[PDB]
Amino acid sequence: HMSYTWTGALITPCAAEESKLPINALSNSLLRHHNMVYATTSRSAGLRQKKVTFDRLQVLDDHYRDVLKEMKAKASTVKAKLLSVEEACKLTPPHSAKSKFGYGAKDVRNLSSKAVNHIHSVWKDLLEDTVTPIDTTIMAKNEVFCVQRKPARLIVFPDLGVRVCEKMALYDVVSTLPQVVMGSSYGFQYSPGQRVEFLVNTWKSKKNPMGFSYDTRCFDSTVTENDIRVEESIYQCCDLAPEARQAIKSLTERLYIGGPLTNSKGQNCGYRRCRASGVLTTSCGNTLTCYLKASAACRAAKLQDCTMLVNGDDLVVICESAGTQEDAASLRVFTEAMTRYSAPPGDPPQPEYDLELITSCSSNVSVAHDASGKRVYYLTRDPTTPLARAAWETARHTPVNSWLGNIIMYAPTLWARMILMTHFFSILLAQEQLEKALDCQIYGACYSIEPLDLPQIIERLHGLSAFSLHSYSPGEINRVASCLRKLGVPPLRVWRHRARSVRARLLSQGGRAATCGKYLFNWAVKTKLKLTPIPAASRLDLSGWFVAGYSGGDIYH
Ligand SMILES: C[C@@H]1C[C@H](C)CN(C(=O)c2cc(Br)ccc2N)C1
Numbered sequence: 026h027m028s029y030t031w032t033g034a035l036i037t038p039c040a041a042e043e044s045k046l047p048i049n050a051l052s053n054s055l056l057r058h059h060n061m062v063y064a065t066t067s068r069s070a071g072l073r074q075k076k077v078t079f080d081r082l083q084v085l086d087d088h089y090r091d092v093l094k095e096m097k098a099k100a101s102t103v104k105a106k107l108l109s110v111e112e113a114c115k116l117t118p119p120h121s122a123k124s125k126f127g128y129g130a131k132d133v134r135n136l137s138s139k140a141v142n143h144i145h146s147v148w149k150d151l152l153e154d155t156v157t158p159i160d161t162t163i164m165a166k167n168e169v170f171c172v173q174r175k176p177a178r179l180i181v182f183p184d185l186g187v188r189v190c191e192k193m194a195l196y197d198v199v200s201t202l203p204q205v206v207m208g209s210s211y212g213f214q215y216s217p218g219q220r221v222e223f224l225v226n227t228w229k230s231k232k233n234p235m236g237f238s239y240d241t242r243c244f245d246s247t248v249t250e251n252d253i254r255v256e257e258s259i260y261q262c263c264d265l266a267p268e269a270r271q272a273i274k275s276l277t278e279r280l281y282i283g284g285p286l287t288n289s290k291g292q293n294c295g296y297r298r299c300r301a302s303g304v305l306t307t308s309c310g311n312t313l314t315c316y317l318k319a320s321a322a323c324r325a326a327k328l329q330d331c332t333m334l335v336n337g338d339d340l341v342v343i344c345e346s347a348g349t350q351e352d353a354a355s356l357r358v359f360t361e362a363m364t365r366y367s368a369p370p371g372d373p374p375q376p377e378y379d380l381e382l383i384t385s386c387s388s389n390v391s392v393a394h395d396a397s398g399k400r401v402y403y404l405t406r407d408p409t410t411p412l413a414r415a416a417w418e419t420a421r422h423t424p425v426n427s428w429l430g431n432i433i434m435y436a437p438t439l440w441a442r443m444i445l446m447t448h449f450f451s452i453l454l455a456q457e458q459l460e461k462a463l464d465c466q467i468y469g470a471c472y473s474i475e476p477l478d479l480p481q482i483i484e485r486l487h488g489l490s491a492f493s494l495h496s497y498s499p500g501e502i503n504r505v506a507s508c509l510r511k512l513g514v515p516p517l518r519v520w521r522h523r524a525r526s527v528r529a530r531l532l533s534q535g536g537r538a539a540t541c542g543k544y545l546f547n548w549a550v551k552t553k554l555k556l557t558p559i560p561a562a563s564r565l566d567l568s569g570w571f572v573a574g575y576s577g578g579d580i581y582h
Pocket residue numbers: 438439442443494495496497502517518521548549
């Protein structure tokens with residue numbers, strides 16, 4: 026029951042890899058401590074292999090089978106449709122990895138006959154063959170962080186023609202089933218504001234609240250063949266077309282449960298018997314599995330009136346305190362239960378009695394005041410990684426723009442507003458590139474977004490108050506200011522000064538550019554403009570934005 030077996034062939038790169046922060050003429054205006062920032066590369070892939078490779082034991086009790094029967098009961102109410110090849114093709118990202126069979130993402134997206142014809146052959150093969158393990162590629166991810174050095178994460182993915190096939194059979198299921206099965210507990214159904222609202226309401230719903238986040242050690246690697254078969258049995262509860270049932274059975278047997286790993290040079294690297302990081306079911310399967318194990322462990326631990334919020338492998342529980350010493354014991358039992366279910370902890374969970382101090386999905390609730398003076402809750406996070414990534418994107422073009430996703434998700438925040446908007450607006454102004462659509466990711470799915478649509482996008486997701494928050498909490502202010510020291514980023518007084526300039530330049534452009542100046546930087550000027558509902562915002566087609574998680578799933582919306 027080892028998570029992985031290995032040949033000793035190396036995990037190899039596709040192109041040359043950069044680990045040090047690329048530097049240009051714009052770098053110093055953002056950050057001076059260039060050595061704090063790095064990108065992971067295949068050079069550390071061996072250290073990751075070590076970490077992810079382990080024996081899994083699972084003991085499954087009555088609480089577990091009880092939760093699952095309940096889940097399947099809910100799953101039986103889902104009706105899900107097959108996608109046409111064409112619909113599946115339009116969900117493929119433009120920069121998704123090319124097929125080994127002589128076509129790429131551009132070909133799939135164009136609906137070309139070489140691509141489409143191959144995808145059809147892959148589909149027919151899935152219908153006819155439910156046993157032969159499907160080939161996959163293993164790679165080291167190149168990802169950017171600030172020190173305190175992580176080894177590269179691994180991505181494991183099947184060929185392009187198989188990914189399109191997954192969309193056909195499962196895209197509707199993974200999009201629909203988790204909310205139905207999990208209700209209010211399914212995290213990816215919420216905008217950041219809706220998330221805050223859920224955590225706040227939930228917290229307020231207990232006489233003596235206590236909460237904790239649960240950090241599973243390498244979750245993908247803890248996921249067993251049992252876990253995967255269990256997920257498939259949930260999928261099959263849906264009302265599906267016969268071809269869909271057969272294709273799902275096949276993908277589960279041939280791909281999801283495990284398979285051979287091939288490097289970029291075509292050498293056999295070993296064998297996977299755990300969650301593949303790069304398949305469509307990655308987010309939905311982790312969420313369901315995490316929910317099943319956690320819900321059962323809550324029963325084993327006898328947590329009182331617990332409420333969970335789950336996003337893939339990210340788990341937060343809020344419940345009724347039974348006192349400081351009883352809570353610590355409860356959490357021990359919870360952790361023992363999760364371990365038996367093959368989800369042992371990284372850092373062991375600790376009970377928290379302040380909502381603002383609970384971190385889940387790398388984020389926490391904080392408090393600011395709106396234009397009326399009223400305390401308002403909002404979602405923030407520690408800015409270190411958004412800024413390290415922003416430093417990289419200042420000097421390099423990337424397929425996915427972190428800074429843009431961060432402005433979108435963290436728009437009400439002190440640091441997104443003063444640092445991210447100012448800095449990137451400055452850059453795009455200077456290159457007359459305000460009108461250029463850029464790719465970014467939200468809950469794993471990729472979106473092409475025009476920076477000039479940011480006021481409307483923001484109003485529609487966070488509301489007009491995102492443009493007027495002030496008097497941030499001493500705790501938030503100081504985490505930001507402490508992040509700026511560590512990175513060597515100019516202090517906020519500098520950013521305020523720069524934003525006034527950026528604001529004036531944007532206004533001078535007229536049109537959408539002036540809207541960005543008006544709405545995004547009103548915080549920067551003492552003589553404040555009247556911020557009214559933007560007409561275009563109500564016309565914005567933001568369906569499928571905050572519906573499901575697609576991390577690893579090769580989705581383009
Ligand atoms: C805590 C920050 C410290 C900085 C010097 C000035 N300052 C701001 O410009 C500010 C920024 C935003 Br965004 C909202 C309200 C504000 N008063 C507040």
